[PDB]
Design a protein around this ligand. Structure first.
Ligand SMILES: [K+]
Ligand SMILES: [K+]
Ligand SMILES: [K+]
Ligand SMILES: [K+]
Ligand SMILES: [K+]
Ligand SMILES: [Mg+2]
Ligand SMILES: [Mg+2]
Ligand SMILES: [Mg+2]
Ligand SMILES: [Mg+2]
Ligand SMILES: [Mg+2]
Lengths: 149, 178, 96, 169, 221
RNA sequence: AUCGAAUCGCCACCUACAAGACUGGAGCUUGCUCCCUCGAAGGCGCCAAGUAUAUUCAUGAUCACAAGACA
RNA sequence: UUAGGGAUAUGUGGCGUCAAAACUUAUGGGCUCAUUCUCGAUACGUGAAAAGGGUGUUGGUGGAUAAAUCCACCGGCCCCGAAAAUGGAUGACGCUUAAGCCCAAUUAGUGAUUGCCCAUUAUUCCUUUGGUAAGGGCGGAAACAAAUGGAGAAAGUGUAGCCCUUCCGAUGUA
RNA sequence: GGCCAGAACCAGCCCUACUGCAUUAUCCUGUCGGGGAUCAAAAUCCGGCGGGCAACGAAGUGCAAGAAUCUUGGGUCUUGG
């Protein structure tokens, strides 16, 4: 129904829903567990921020192909997620050539505060808080092809 | 495993003509992998017995006969096979099976193993379920005991295909290469 | 032999149904040369500069009933010096 | 041990689409095949099983050859063979294997946490016991060395050497 | 073999600790010779480093006299013009196993020679192998699942000792001493093993109850 | 000291041993019954040294040999 | 049966290692044990063997007698017959709960009717080349400087082939 | 940027899922009589007689045409965007 040219157009799979806890498979924070917040418009990348207090993953954008979306979810409805726009991650271009902007630090601080509260309010919140602090690794003898997530 | 032979009843006749306006209708018992082989055997029997060729006849039916409910039974199979030196040898054997098709397939395997006979040199004369007290061979009669039991010895038990391994620790179940 | 396609045996993948899970996954052969040449993020990440090199490819289909997989490397075949050597089968592109 | 293949013997299916399921032998066809049925299992209707695919159990209900379904049900209920089997360790292991097969990532994390907690408390208990009665390598070595160290450190030259080089620390 | 002084100085200069590669040690006792050899050959071609011990306890189907006559027929082959440089007929069981594995490999290519050189074979379990780690077996190649028990079989050590192997008694004495020493050490350390078992039992009464519940759900308690 | 490398499980609980026509133990009835620790796990390791109240992680900006490796 | 390349299928032949494929498949049935040319395992290729024999084992057929026997007679596999000159060839190793032989499957009495691996073959895609080739267009369509959409358009055997579209064939000694 | 890599979507292919129709009877039951074997049975087995769908994950029997759109299958560094 939604036109392919409209920003509201997504072909994302059902598992990568907002609130789902996802294992990061590539990039700097590989093996970490984050929380899927939203998907950027125009079938853009997912936005994950596993609370940086828990695992150190900031508000980042990640392709849905480099994440394993698990069946464990967290109620995100209390989290705004509106201020996370595509223009947040855009940067000015250099001309013929850790530090974080106050806008990015403020957005992370406000989002993570509402994200941590949503985890605490949820049943098994302490178990899911420690779930996000754990690290996923492929061990000798592991068979992820046989697993259920 | 289910039997590789199926029970077919092939009903056929010669095509009516001016000499034979109402031809005789023949019913045939065959055990064949498929209905094409069933019809081939039916027409071979009609040619060698009733002098009727497949080109001058027709087939009214080539249906399959459903097996009875599975019960451990004794099946008497009267069968015959051809060898060059021995000619036609007819024998009667007893088998322990759960179905007529299973017993006849077991008979075909037994003939192939013990006498080197193939499917097209074997004619099944009859197969029937006989009582316990009519069994002659002791190898079959030994299963009639009311209290029959035995242990499973020398069993090469293989692991599940998903759990099989190449290298396993000596006295543990831990797999080193799998 | 046809060098355009390679056979890869992954640990704990011992069935064709298991090898079908890895179809489309990325595959890497890591080796080293003799001199430090250019790499990804040669300027962004100078710590990455090394004699370490990697050839990338993808899983195309399973091979046999015992969990082997066919792999096609990007543009060029994998060297025959990689035979009997370690290969990395990554978990992306994810489908779960 | 080795339990005989008899009419009424309880067996567990080794491989196949019916694996890890428990049935009762109701008839013996020949040396290779038997007839198996279990009224309390949906997929365990009367069928033929190769004797290489069954594992005899220690329970054997009282039935006759080619017994009826009602007779099998009554014998199973009276003997309570399934209830007794459910209490063993291999049945619990089969159920745990199924649970692990169907487990999710959160369940795997929970199991890892439980195993780590048990390991930590086992370490604490072992340390407590080993402080009293040495069994570890370091505690046995300390017990062996204590007497010689006490003998060799009681000398005045040793004592003075300690005091002098401790006052410098 | 023996390390060079250059290698020792370089190791000291880099400061790296001791290193041991990933080596699979296989207890070849009561294994079928050809089937174990084929499995080991495929594993060697797949880049594995494999040490095999107790090569004197490998089994072959048939009578010992039949297999002795087979080895004598093998020994009958020699280059008449120059027996030196002809076939070399090794009598040790480990040498027999290595020859059998070599005949399952492309021995005339560099890849096949690397695969063959990745294999080490011993009689018995030598001291440098005893404590390296848990030995493994090949279930596809064990006699109790590969041989009809009614048929006769031969032991490779017994067959080889009658074709010109001199160290059967030496290997027997060394194996007897090894088993005695290992049995003494296993009779010891029983207190340590029982203490660890009791600690695992007692931890269940001190860990959280929901963790014990998870353990019971997954079959660990 | 060149030298940047490929390799990605630790253990001082596996790292003793034997058997499959058996190898938890009884009974006599000898294939059933009974008992037991119930006959289907080497121990850990996987991010709070432990299951909770924690806590630093960004800008390495969406994949790239893990940008690191004394477990 | 052969333009030069890809993908996907097959054929003959195979799936213990060499060597791709059953990481030695089944939750198929029997038969076979073979001590110095060392049982057997590839048709063609006696490219190794008979006549004759066996109280080896396991199947038939017709008799006889009464605790089941024994009498003749036919299969099957194995054994004896069966001796040559360099050391040697199932293909090498090896295999005998076959990796041998006869039969039958395709994940196995569960719920239907394609296990897997290898061609200069099949199907399809791309490019070339040549047709007993098949068609279109070819009366510049209107507009339109630079600084700051573009070019070309040949009435044509053969060219950098006038351009476009379509189909089919392509190995080869003298 | 006429380089390298990754994700999106198009179109065309190429793979997979998802199944309906017809059959059954030498069959399925019950009940009598035999017959069988047991300690007694039961069953295998054979006749009557009365029913009937073994029933759709019944059957390994014939043929299947089910829009991968509903219901974001997979692949295409095997095509071109
Ligand atoms: K000599
Ligand atoms: K067989
Ligand atoms: K042309
Ligand atoms: K011209
Ligand atoms: K791509
Ligand atoms: Mg690196
Ligand atoms: Mg192909
Ligand atoms: Mg292979
Ligand atoms: Mg032209
Ligand atoms: Mg030409």
């Amino acid at each position: 129904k939604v036109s392919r040219k409209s920003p509201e157009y997504t072909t994302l799979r059902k598992s990568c829903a907002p609130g789902a806890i996802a294992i990061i498979l590539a990039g700097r924070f590989r093996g970490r567990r984050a929380v899927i917040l939203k998907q950027l418009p125009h079938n853009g990348p997912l936005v994950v921020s596993g609370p940086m207090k828990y695992n150190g993953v900031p508000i980042r954008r990640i392709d849905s192909r480099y994440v394993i979306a698990t069946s464990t979810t967290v109620d995100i409805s209390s989290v705004d997620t509106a201020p996370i726009t595509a223009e947040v991650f855009q940067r000015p271009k250099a001309e013929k050539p850790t530090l974080v902007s106050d806008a990015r630090a403020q957005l992370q601080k406000k989002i993570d505060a509402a994200l941590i509260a949503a985890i605490k309010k949820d049943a098994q919140g302490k178990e899911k808080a420690g779930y996000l602090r754990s690290v996923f690794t492929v061990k000798p003898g592991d068979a992820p092809h046989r697993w259920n997530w | 495993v289910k039997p590789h032979l199926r029970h077919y009843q092939v009903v056929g006749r010669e095509s009516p003509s001016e000499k034979n306006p109402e031809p005789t209708v023949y019913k045939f018992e065959v055990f064949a992998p498929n209905f094409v082989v069933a019809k081939s055997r039916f027409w071979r029997m009609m040619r060698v017995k009733n002098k009727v060729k497949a080109t001058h006849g027709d087939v009214l039916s080539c249906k399959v006969v459903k097996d009875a409910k599975l019960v451990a039974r004794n099946y008497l199979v009267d069968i015959a096979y051809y060898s060059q030196r021995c000619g036609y040898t007819r024998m009667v054997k007893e088998f322990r099976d759960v179905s007529k098709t299973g017993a006849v397939s077991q008979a075909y395997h037994d003939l192939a193993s013990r006498h080197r006979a193939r499917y097209h040199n074997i004619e099944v004369l009859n197969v029937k379920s006989i009582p316990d007290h009519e069994v002659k061979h002791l190898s079959i009669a030994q299963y009639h005991a009311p209290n029959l039991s035995f242990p499973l010895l020398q069993r090469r038990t293989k692991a599940t295909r998903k759990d099989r391994a190449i290298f396993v620790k000596k006295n543990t179940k831990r797999a080193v290469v799998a | 032999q046809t060098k355009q396609t390679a056979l890869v045996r992954v640990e704990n993948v011992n069935t064709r149904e298991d090898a079908t899970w890895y179809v489309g996954k990325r595959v890497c052969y890591v080796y080293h040369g003799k001199k430090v040449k250019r790499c990804v993020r040669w300027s962004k990440a100078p710590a990455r500069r090394s004699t370490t090199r990697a050839l990338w490819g993808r899983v195309t289909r399973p091979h046999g009933n015992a969990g082997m997989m066919r792999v096609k490397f990007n543009g060029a075949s994998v060297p025959a010096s990689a035979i009997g050597r370690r290969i990395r089968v990554y978990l992306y592109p994810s489908q779960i | 041990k080795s339990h005989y293949i008899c009419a009424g013997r309880l067996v567990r299916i080794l491989r196949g689409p019916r694996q890890d399921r428990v049935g009762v032998i109701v008839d013996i066809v020949d040396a290779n095949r038997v007839l198996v049925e279990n009224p309390e299992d949906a997929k365990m209707w009367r069928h033929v099983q190769n004797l290489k695919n069954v594992e005899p159990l220690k329970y054997c209900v009282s039935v006759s050859r080619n017994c009826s379904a009602k007779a099998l049900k009554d014998a199973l209920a009276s003997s309570k063979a399934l209830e007794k089997y459910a209490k063993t360790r291999t049945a619990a292991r089969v159920e745990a294997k199924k649970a692990c097969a169907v487990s999710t990532d959160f369940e795997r994390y929970q199991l890892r946490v439980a195993r780590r907690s048990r390991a930590h408390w086992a370490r604490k208990v072992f340390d407590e016991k080993d402080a009293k009665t040495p069994v570890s390598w370091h505690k046995v070595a300390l017990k062996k060395m204590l007497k010689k160290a006490a003998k060799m450190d009681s000398t005045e030259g040793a004592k003075r050497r300690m005091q002098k080089a401790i006052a410098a620390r | 073999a023996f390390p060079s002084r250059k290698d020792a100085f370089r190791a000291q200069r880099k400061g790296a600790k001791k290193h041991r590669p990933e080596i699979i040690v296989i207890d070849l006792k009561d294994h079928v010779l050809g089937r174990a050899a084929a499995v080991v050959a495929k594993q060697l071609l797949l880049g594995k480093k494999i040490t095999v011990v107790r090569c004197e306890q490998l089994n072959i189907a048939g009578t010992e006299i039949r297999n002795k006559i087979k080895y004598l027929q093998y020994l009958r082959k020699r280059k008449l013009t120059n027996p030196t440089k002809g076939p070399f007929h090794h009598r040790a069981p480990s040498d027999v196993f290595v020859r059998t594995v070599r005949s399952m490999l492309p021995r005339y290519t560099k890849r096949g020679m690397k695969a063959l050189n990745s294999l080490v074979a011993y009689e018995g379990i030598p001291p440098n192998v005893v404590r390296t780690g848990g030995r493994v077996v090949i279930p596809r190649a064990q006699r109790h699942v590969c041989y009809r028990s009614e048929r006769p079989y031969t032991v490779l050590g017994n067959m080889c000792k009658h074709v010109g192997w001199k160290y059967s008694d030496v290997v027997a004495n060394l194996e007897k001493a090894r088993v005695e020493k290992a049995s003494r050490h296993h009779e010891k350390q029983a207190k340590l093993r029982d203490a660890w078992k009791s600690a695992r039992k007692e931890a269940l009464a001190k860990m959280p109850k929901h963790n014990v519940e998870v353990l019971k759900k997954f079959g660990y308690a």
